[PDB]
Amino acid sequence: MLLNSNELEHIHSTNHSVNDISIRWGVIGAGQKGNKEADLFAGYKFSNGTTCYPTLAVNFAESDMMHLQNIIKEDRIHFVVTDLFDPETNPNANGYLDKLAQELGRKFTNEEGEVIVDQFLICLGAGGGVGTGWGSLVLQLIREQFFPCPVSMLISLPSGDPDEINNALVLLSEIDEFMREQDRLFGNSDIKPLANVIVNDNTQMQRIIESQKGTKDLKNRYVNWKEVANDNVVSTLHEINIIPENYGSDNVTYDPSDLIKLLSIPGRFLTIGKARIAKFDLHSLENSIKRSLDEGFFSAEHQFETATMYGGFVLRPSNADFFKDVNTENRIRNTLGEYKRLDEIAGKFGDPIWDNEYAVCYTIFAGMTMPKRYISLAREGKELAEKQEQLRA
Numbered sequence: 466m467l468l469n470s471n472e473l474e475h476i477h478s479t480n481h482s483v484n485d486i487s488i489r490w491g492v493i494g495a496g497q498k499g500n501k502e503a504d505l506f507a508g509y510k511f512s513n514g515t516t517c518y519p520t521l522a523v524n525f526a527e528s529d530m531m532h533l534q535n536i537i538k539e540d541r542i543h544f545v546v547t548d549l550f551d552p553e554t555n556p557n558a559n560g561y562l563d564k565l566a567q568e569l570g571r572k573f574t575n576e577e578g579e580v581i582v583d584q585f586l587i588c589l590g591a592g593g594g595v596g597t598g599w600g601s602l603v604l605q606l607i608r609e610q611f612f613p614c615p616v617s618m619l620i621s622l623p624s625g626d627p628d629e630i631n632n633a634l635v636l637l638s639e640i641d642e643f644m645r646e647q648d649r650l651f652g653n654s655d656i657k658p659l660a661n662v663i664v665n666d667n668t669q670m671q672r673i674i675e676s677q678k679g680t681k682d683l684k685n686r687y688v689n690w691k692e693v694a695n696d697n698v699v700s701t702l703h704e705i706n707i708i709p710e711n712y713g714s715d716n717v718t719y720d721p722s723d724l725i726k727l728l729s730i731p732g733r734f735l736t737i738g739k740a741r742i743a744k745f746d747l748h749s750l751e752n753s754i755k756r757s758l759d760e761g762f763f764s765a766e767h768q769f770e771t772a773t774m775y776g777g778f779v780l781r782p783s784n785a786d787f788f789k790d791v792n793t794e795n796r797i798r799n800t801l802g803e804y805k806r807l808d809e810i811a812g813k814f815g816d817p818i819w820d821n822e823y824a825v826c827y828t829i830f831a832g833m834t835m836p837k838r839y840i841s842l843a844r845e846g847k848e849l850a851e852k853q854e855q856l857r858a
């Protein structure tokens with residue numbers, strides 16, 4: 466099975482009853498980046514050997530997905546992107562539609578036509594052609610009530626390319642508009658057709674990866690940082706899914722129902738901060754949580770102040786005085802409070818226990834408005850395009 470992180474290693478190593486998750490994701494990747502992500506999700510298995518998430522990958526040609534390793538060929542669906550399905554500016558548009566519907570219907574339904582997932586997790590890299598194109602397509606499909614369940618979009622943001630930036634800003638703007646209409650029409654407590662959008666910033670993940678690993682001068686120079694980024698992003702998502710359902714606490718227990726609400730009710734931008742805490746002291750704890758939020762894999766200058774829900778849990782060792790001290794609890798609370806006053810929004814923070822000697826703090830903020838990365842990207846995009854036009858001879 467896939468053991469994408471030290472935490473997944475420790476879990477399946479000390480827990481042989483990991484046979485269910487909090488929410489049954491139906492994973493669908495689109496474009497190279499998306500496919501790579503979905504291929505990792507397809508690699509996860511329960512203690513009993515069965516597969517965790519049914520997944521499909523999408524792209525234009527068979528060639529694009531030739532190197533997938535966990536998604537069998539049958540599930541590798543092949544067919545700008547918006548034109549094809551557009552019942553007009555592309556003949557037999559319904560053809561592609563019916564095919565998408567059939568493939569989705571055959572992979573996410575049992576024998577009697579019943580959906581076997583709770584929510585669709587669509588992964589894609591913004592900035593590319595098929596990627597952003599699919600993202601934009603997903604929005605129109607949701608507006609057309611295409612999906613039988615809510616959809617969660619996991620999106621990476623580009624950099625270094627003005628053309629990719631512009632494509633990503635167009636999508637984000639379309640996402641934000643969709644969210645505005647959905648937020649006005651649905652009650653703050655109803656399940657939303659667009660559950661959430663989780664953004665990843667390539668520039669941010671690259672810096673994190675290239676700063677670490679290389680305490681000398683040999684950065685290996687051959688390791689694709691993106692592969693490392695994908696592992697970190699996907700294992701975090703998988704981990705937050707299995708923890709609530711497989712781990713409990715003797716104090717504040719976080720349940721799958723809490724996770725489900727957090728992921729489906731807010732309906733806007735959501736982020737995650739995973740902080741491993743081996744050093745059991747207040748300053749190290751605060752510092753690790755803050756780094757995970759402001760300089761972690763899911764950081765994108767989020768508008769934490771606009772969050773409407775939060776959640777999370779510190780998976781801590783049994784019989785560890787540090788994580789049974791009021792000063793610790795107060796530090797965690799006080800630390801999250803610097804991002805968004807918890808007393809003002811729904812949500813809870815649990816402290817599940819696992820059979821290991823270090824703790825991991827998973828902090829989640831949901832229902833936020835446009836990540837400010839939209840702004841820094843629009844600025845960087847303008848600069849690149851300028852130095853581009855400039856210098857030119």
Ligand SMILES: Nc1nc2c(ncn2[C@@H]2O[C@H](COP(=O)(O)OP(=O)(O)OP(O)(O)=S)[C@@H](O)[C@H]2O)c(=O)[nH]1
Pocket residue numbers: 495496497498499501590591592593594595596597621622623624629665667691692694695
């Ligand atoms: N985080 C992450 N980003 C990736 C990965 N592969 C590509 N990217 C980034 O994602 C963006 C789009 O990637 P890609 O998936 O190639 O787009 P696409 O539309 O599917 O490809 P095309 O149609 O332009 S060739 C680019 O900005 C690229 O730098 C990956 O495995 N992880």
